[PDB]
Design an enzyme around this catalytic site. Sequence first.
Site, mmCIF file in Angstrom:
data_model
loop_
_atom_site.group_PDB
_atom_site.id
_atom_site.type_symbol
_atom_site.label_atom_id
_atom_site.label_comp_id
_atom_site.label_asym_id
_atom_site.label_seq_id
_atom_site.Cartn_x
_atom_site.Cartn_y
_atom_site.Cartn_z
ATOM 1 N N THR A 100 16.101 36.461 -71.125
ATOM 2 C CA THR A 100 15.566 35.520 -70.105
ATOM 3 C C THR A 100 16.354 34.235 -70.180
ATOM 4 O O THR A 100 16.459 33.607 -71.231
ATOM 5 C CB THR A 100 14.078 35.178 -70.333
ATOM 6 O OG1 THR A 100 13.277 36.371 -70.219
ATOM 7 C CG2 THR A 100 13.610 34.107 -69.301
ATOM 8 N N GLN A 101 16.912 33.847 -69.045
ATOM 9 C CA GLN A 101 17.715 32.654 -68.975
ATOM 10 C C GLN A 101 17.363 31.905 -67.703
ATOM 11 O O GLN A 101 16.327 32.149 -67.084
ATOM 12 C CB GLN A 101 19.196 33.064 -68.999
ATOM 13 C CG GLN A 101 19.557 34.268 -68.111
ATOM 14 C CD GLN A 101 21.035 34.673 -68.260
ATOM 15 O OE1 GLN A 101 21.359 35.618 -68.986
ATOM 16 N NE2 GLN A 101 21.936 33.944 -67.585
ATOM 17 N N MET B 45 15.426 42.390 -70.419
ATOM 18 C CA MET B 45 14.941 41.020 -70.294
ATOM 19 C C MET B 45 16.021 39.961 -70.516
ATOM 20 O O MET B 45 15.750 38.888 -71.047
ATOM 21 C CB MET B 45 13.791 40.773 -71.272
ATOM 22 C CG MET B 45 12.549 41.567 -70.978
ATOM 23 S SD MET B 45 11.945 41.311 -69.308
ATOM 24 C CE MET B 45 11.025 39.817 -69.443
#
Lengths: 204, 233, 196, 196, 222, 198, 198, 212, 222
Positions: free
Chosen positions: B1-2, B107
């Site tokens: 996740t970024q 993710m």
Amino acid sequence: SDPSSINGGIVVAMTGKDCVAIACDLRLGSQSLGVSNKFEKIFHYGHVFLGITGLATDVTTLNEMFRYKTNLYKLKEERAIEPETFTQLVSSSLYERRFGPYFVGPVVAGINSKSGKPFIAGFDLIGCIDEAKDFIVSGTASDQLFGMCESLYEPNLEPEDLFETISQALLNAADRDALSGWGAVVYIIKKDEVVKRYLKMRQD
Amino acid sequence: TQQPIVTGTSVISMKYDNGVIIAADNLGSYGSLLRFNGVERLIPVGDNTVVGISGDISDMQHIERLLKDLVTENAYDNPLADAEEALEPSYIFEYLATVMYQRRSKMNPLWNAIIVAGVQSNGDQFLRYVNLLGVTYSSPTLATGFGAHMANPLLRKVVDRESDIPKTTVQVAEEAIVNAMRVLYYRDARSSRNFSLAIIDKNTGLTFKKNLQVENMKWDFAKDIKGYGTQKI
Amino acid sequence: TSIMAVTFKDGVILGADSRTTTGAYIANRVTDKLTRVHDKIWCCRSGSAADTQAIADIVQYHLELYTSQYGTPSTETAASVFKELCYENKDNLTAGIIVAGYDDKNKGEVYTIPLGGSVHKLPYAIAGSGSTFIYGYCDKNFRENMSKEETVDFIKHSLSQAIKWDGSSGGVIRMVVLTAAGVERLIFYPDEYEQL
Amino acid sequence: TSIMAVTFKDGVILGADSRTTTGAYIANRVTDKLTRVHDKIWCCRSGSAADTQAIADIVQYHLELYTSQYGTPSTETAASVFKELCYENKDNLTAGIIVAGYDDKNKGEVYTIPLGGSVHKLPYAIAGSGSTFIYGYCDKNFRENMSKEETVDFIKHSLSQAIKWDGSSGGVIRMVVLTAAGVERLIFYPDEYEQL
Amino acid sequence: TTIVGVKFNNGVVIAADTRSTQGPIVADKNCAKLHRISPKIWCAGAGTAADTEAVTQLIGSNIELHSLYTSREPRVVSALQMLKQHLFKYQGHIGAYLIVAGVDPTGSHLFSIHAHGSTDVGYYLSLGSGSLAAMAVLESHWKQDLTKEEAIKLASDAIQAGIWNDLGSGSNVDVCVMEIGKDAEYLRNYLTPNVREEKQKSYKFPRGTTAVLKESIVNICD
Amino acid sequence: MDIILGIRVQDSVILASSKAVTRGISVLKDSDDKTRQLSPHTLMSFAGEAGDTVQFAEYIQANIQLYSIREDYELSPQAVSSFVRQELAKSIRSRRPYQVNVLIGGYDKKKNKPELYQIDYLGTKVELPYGAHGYSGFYTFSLLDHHYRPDMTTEEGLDLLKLCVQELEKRMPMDFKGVIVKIVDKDGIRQVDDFQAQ
Amino acid sequence: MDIILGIRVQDSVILASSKAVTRGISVLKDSDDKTRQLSPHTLMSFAGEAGDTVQFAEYIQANIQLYSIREDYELSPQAVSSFVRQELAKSIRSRRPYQVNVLIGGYDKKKNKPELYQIDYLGTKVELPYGAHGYSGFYTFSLLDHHYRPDMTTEEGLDLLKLCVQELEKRMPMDFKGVIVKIVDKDGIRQVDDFQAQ
Amino acid sequence: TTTLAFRFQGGIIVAVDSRATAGNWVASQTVKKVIEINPFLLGTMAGGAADCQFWETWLGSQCRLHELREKERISVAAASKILSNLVYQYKGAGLSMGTMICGYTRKEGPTIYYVDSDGTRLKGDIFCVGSGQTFAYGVLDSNYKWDLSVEDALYLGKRSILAAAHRDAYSGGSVNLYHVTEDGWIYHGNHDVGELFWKVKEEEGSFNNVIG
Amino acid sequence: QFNPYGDNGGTILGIAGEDFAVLAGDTRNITDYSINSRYEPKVFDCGDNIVMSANGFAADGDALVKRFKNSVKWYHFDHNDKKLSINSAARNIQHLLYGKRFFPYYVHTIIAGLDEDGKGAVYSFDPVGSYEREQCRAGGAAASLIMPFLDNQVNFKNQYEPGTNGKVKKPLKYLSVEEVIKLVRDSFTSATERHIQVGDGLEILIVTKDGVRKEFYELKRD
Ligand SMILES: */C1=C\C(=O)NCC/C=C/[C@H](NC(=O)[C@@H](NC(=O)N[C@H](C(=O)O)C(C)C)C(C)C)C(=O)N[C@H]1C(C)C
Ligand SMILES: */C1=C\C(=O)NCC/C=C/[C@H](NC(=O)[C@@H](NC(=O)N[C@H](C(=O)O)C(C)C)C(C)C)C(=O)N[C@H]1C(C)C
Ligand SMILES: */C1=C\C(=O)NCC/C=C/[C@H](NC(=O)[C@@H](NC(=O)N[C@H](C(=O)O)C(C)C)C(C)C)C(=O)N[C@H]1C(C)C
Ligand SMILES: */C1=C\C(=O)NCC/C=C/[C@H](NC(=O)[C@@H](NC(=O)N[C@H](C(=O)O)C(C)C)C(C)C)C(=O)N[C@H]1C(C)C
């Protein structure tokens, strides 16, 4: 959560040839718990009918309000209010509570006594008027009702036919909604007479 | 996740009778700061495929290396590397699609919206989309981000359905594209006036036009606009 | 948004871009951010369009009434009414406003009223998202008492750089010249200022 | 923090302020943000001191080993190692780095590696909190192939403006000149650059 | 919702689609988004439908009274000022996004208002979810000095851009032309490009199909 | 919650209400009467928030008594219940709403029939053969749905409750300390002092 | 919570444990035995999280039985309890800790003395004359603090419980459906089948 | 959902409803909430359909392996513990299942185990699981006796699900009945509530409430 | 934060005949209020006379179909091109889905084919694998609009024999492919009118002992 999903219930109106019909279920539950199967959601003032889905307390309250208003209206106007006018009264009454609305889904049905033309209208909780020429749906099973109506419906049905159609739309929609059903009632309205029938449906 | 940092905006495209066209401005924004200006967001793979990318630029640069690597790899022990066994647009896409989905599934997505444009070995026009979620689809016209909202409506007026492709010429098509780019320059606050455009024709091959500019803009009426209602001067 | 006001030899000049936004969408590309509150007292609006318009609309009303009763209001007075509104309502406003006016005894004056509601009289002022990118440029190019030509240039250059780096800015550059000679509206298009 | 790198005729020059902060406290006023990763490949650090130092310290190690095995590394290669580290670890780093190096075949090159981990080769680059205030100024004053004197000036002016507006910047201005002639360290004090 | 406004050489025209929605469900397939403030001042509205209607009638009512009081034709700038100050008073809580236009003793006018109270002025405008689709068309075909017919085409084309490309827009195209010299002409359902194809079958049930538990006549007479 | 049950038989309405009053960790009383007589032939049981419960009941009581004195007449059960609904309906939109649920059992000396009204804190009113507030419903509604007849005698009715109260003592998690029963009929309101073994 | 009581008299340890098993709105069982015999002279009662409760008890049981077979000997009550504490202590810092509280009552055939051990899910162990887990303590600890003697007979002890169980049925909010009693002594473990009226 | 199982003089009775809901939407009225593990084993479903249906099928597999391995039918107690222990492995992960494992073995006789995703395992004579449980318990508790004709018990079970289907918004569709004897389980039909309600109403005189 | 899921709309339908079965779906793919494509196939022929569609989040839907098709391919390798019965396919789909029980394929899938007796069959699954065989089933965006209709017109619910005092339910006759295609079209044209995510086109796959056949009809594009 959603106030309009505490008690459950649906209403639906339809126009036929020189007639209008409006039906509703009879359920009044509290979430999953069924509480009453005698909660009619259709009312009338003179020759104008009003169905109301949503939070029961408000359904009751609005009926008592429109009775109050329609009574004074008759005393002053010296005539019973018409469908179109009443629709306006319903709309302004709701919008007056714009930022703390009643959680209801009003539906109006009737025949203009002066023009004999059939009339039906729906409203969102703050008064947005939807005046359809074919049908109006309201309640926790409105999606189902839209599906039923959009298919089953066809213009100028005779009272006896409109009755089959509206009853089938209501019945099959309610059977797919956990919060609707427990008995239905249907009003067939013509210039001269008005007939009321209770439908036989699943009790689960 | 970024969360994206340096980003490219719209990538628009459509397909005409013989090939497909694709374009994208040369900006690399950093929030509301139009930070970088010589950013090419059209990646040619071989010369029958052009990959247009939008979104996070660092991830784009990464996808660029992946593509060049794909070309190098395909050449290994491949005597038909530039013949029967050269990279097809469909291969390049399926690969990218695969990677994109695996990454979102772990993710850690490649924060991009990608459009693969090109011509198959059998002359067929190829045009498909894939984004950071792995979602994919095709249509006579395709655009990412802001272009999906403004460019598509325009481009669709030229090729509204399948039977319109053969009736559309490169001139008509390229025109629609260039005009859409102008419109995007008018209303997208993250757009640049400079952009690249590429054509992939089954007959003329790959034409890659760099350093274009939005021309013929209407701004004169701006002089007649004063105040915001009642002001007269 | 990029807005500035520069006082020069013959008076004062107001400048602004013409881009209004909602997210990345340019709601208006030909916006007029130079608003008139009196014959020779104008302002530059930045921040909320709704807020700055409402504020300006009110100041204009106050100055009109002020005029009816006590004649012409000073530029200082106009800045005072703006400030009063921006300070007293700081919790519900997002308005960065620049007040510029020309008067026969003071040449041109410039008052900047930032987000807090404070007032700052200055030789020139810059504001809006685009302004951050031209702090250096303007500090190294502003000179007091420039000529109308030099000033128009200084502003055209400054705002072109603002429009260049800040995505919230763009469109045309608008100017309003306030001097003893009257009021002059200037407009510069992309093709002209972009290649400066 | 204000850091920049400009390529000119004879090579390239790196410049930076010397202020490190923790909140409003200046933890160090004589900081050296110009770090050496090789004989003629240096970098400018902005963002986390801990992160940029750790990254630099590692790159230096990689280039030293690279040298032992394959001789001198290019400036491009150095930018590549930085990028690899900044991209692959983007989730746990806050490093805005500028890589500048001089080589006999390419003069001087400049690669800017912003927060995301992307790489950008450029004629010159600016970064750090102070950089925003000099985007306009630098865009209007940079010229390719300036002389060492012009370049030192361009940098001294740009950074003085950055130091002027950005509170996170200040102290002395430091420069490192990378040309075929070698490596030269320059230092400029407040009294000198403030009144420019 | 897609609503637009286009000025032409001697007036102004506004158009809109007719789809009303509640989530992904179409509430009304043919509502009217064009509101009459005064005979020659109409307003197209997007956002919360009940709000576009109420605020529109409120200002309209006040404009009527003002007109009778001042013995003058209503002016668009008045509708504009009354609306914006109202919307502003309500900190954007009245979800109205309007394009107000019309002709009055001072000429033809075209403005737009946003829920929070800001206003714009121009020769062509668009609002609603179809806002971008419509604006692309306008940005691609508007030119200064358009004829009444040119304007209607452009406006009508922009609405279609919405109907076809925006899920929140659909059905018909409503137009209203306000020319500097004549009466304003409202063209309800100017375009109706979405007629439902004839159903494959009739679902008319054979009477007696529905099981009835009880029956009775209702007395409507007093 | 507390147990509030009501069942309308042939010529009377019977109200059963748990006697326990628990506060957190301790049961403070086992003889609490959760009821108020509004008029000689109208009884109201209640359950809900600690303070509002009685405050609301006594408030309603005061008003119904005042109406009686002023008119020298006893409002019908229907009328009394309508008044109560209006009051709760107002409450629901007030600054601090009464968190009270009630059952109204009365004998309409005019129609000469027993009536049972269920009304929640929202102002939801419904007339039923039998009703309950809280969890009790979840058990009893199907017990009565099963063993219930319109013409039942007061005696039969009391037996039907015994049936319900038993099920509640069997499956309900809490110890509500039994119930206090009351019968409203043509002769008024009386308590069944012997139910703790009836 | 559930009622877990333990009282060590003269020559035995007595364990009382509520029989109810409630899940949300319904009491699912009224004959649940919240106990496990670890060895012929060691009994353990438990209360806590739905799954962990038995899983932990049976786990401990298996181990103590295995030790018995391997050594052909029965670990002292003290040793058994120390093992149990170590197990819970580990659990408290594991990924998913056992949410179980226990009372261990055993007769040390060597020292020839009864012993009672209280241990919570944290691995807190204490040896007491009498103990309890949950809310029960809040009522019984002062009852016993009052009427308790070291030399009491098993009979006196059982009467002391009867005293406790009564207070709990009087003041506790829930209906724990009575308790199951068990006595651990020199002759082992046996259940007092007649306590539902003893 | 409403599911019940109870032991009586003639073995075990198992009755369930057949409604599946996704929120307030009625997904299906024809779901099989009873899993036939084998000629002598039945499993009921309450909670998440996928979870129950999947793991109970898996259970059948585990039971079958046990029998091949040990050359003998698995005990109800053991079958229920296989499920119990499996479910405990996933405790905290989100599984949602209120289950009943019912069977008849020579060694155990009629046996019923309640097993939920909490890790709770209980043996008992009567168990009602699901959103409609309380309703079923109301009818069942006050009409249950150990001496019920295999035909009376069958009706009591059926009637209990009927009560639930009526009051519970999440219960409905039809009733599926089973009888369990040492000879195995015997299926006693699927009774649609659509017809069953009216029939029972008319014949029994109950539901006197509803308007007919 | 990062959301790994999306909604591409769509609506699918499955109906079983006595010797055939059908699986239908609109061809519109969306994202919020924008249309991604007016024609993006959603119902697939997987071989052995099995048709399937995993509606909802396209990325997941495609992944599943792909994974199932691959499963069929290996079924052949491992069992001599032996046909995979529809019931077996269903049990397999269940394991594919439940396999991702703790990070589900955000889709609602349906498959159609013929059972071992040549009869038409329809199977539908929930996100994590719960499944059941049925005569008909709608899945997707307008499922709530279509199902009630199918309950009525396919399984004759709430329909009684006229004149039987509502005591004799209308018998369960069985629809012909022609009568079925009609219901399918009316279901979608109806859905298209009230749901903004339904339109553009309708693709129907028909399964018989002779294989899989396709039919395509356009749907309103607004
Ligand atoms: C100058 C740009 C700025 O100074 N600041 C950026 C914020 C923009 C304000 C103004 N535009 C608007 O207010 C638009 N509405 C809006 O942004 N609404 C918010 C939203 O995100 O949708 C709501 C309040 C959360 C619209 C009314 C035009 C703008 O463009 N400012 C310019 C200049 C002063 C016009
Ligand atoms: C350049 C300034 C910047 O580019 N950015 C501002 C952030 C500053 C980073 C660095 N100083 C520090 O990291 C100091 N520690 C610190 O800030 N710790 C935080 C805190 O708020 O206390 C913690 C992590 C929440 C200290 C290690 C010196 C700095 O001054 N950056 C300069 C330049 C690169 C040295
Ligand atoms: C134009 C489309 C839009 O501009 N925006 C999309 C939102 C739609 C608004 C309007 N429909 C409604 O307002 C519906 N009612 C409603 O949303 N009520 C709120 C609620 O959350 O229930 C209340 C006010 C909190 C219903 C009246 C149809 C719509 O369709 N907008 C069109 C155009 C203006 C009719
Ligand atoms: C018994 C009713 C209940 O006991 N409880 C109400 C919850 C209902 C569950 C089940 N229906 C479903 O599980 C539906 N699928 C589902 O919810 N899937 C989840 C999702 O978010 O999509 C997954 C598990 C995360 C669907 C299969 C109908 C139901 O109806 N329960 C019945 C009985 C056991 C079938």
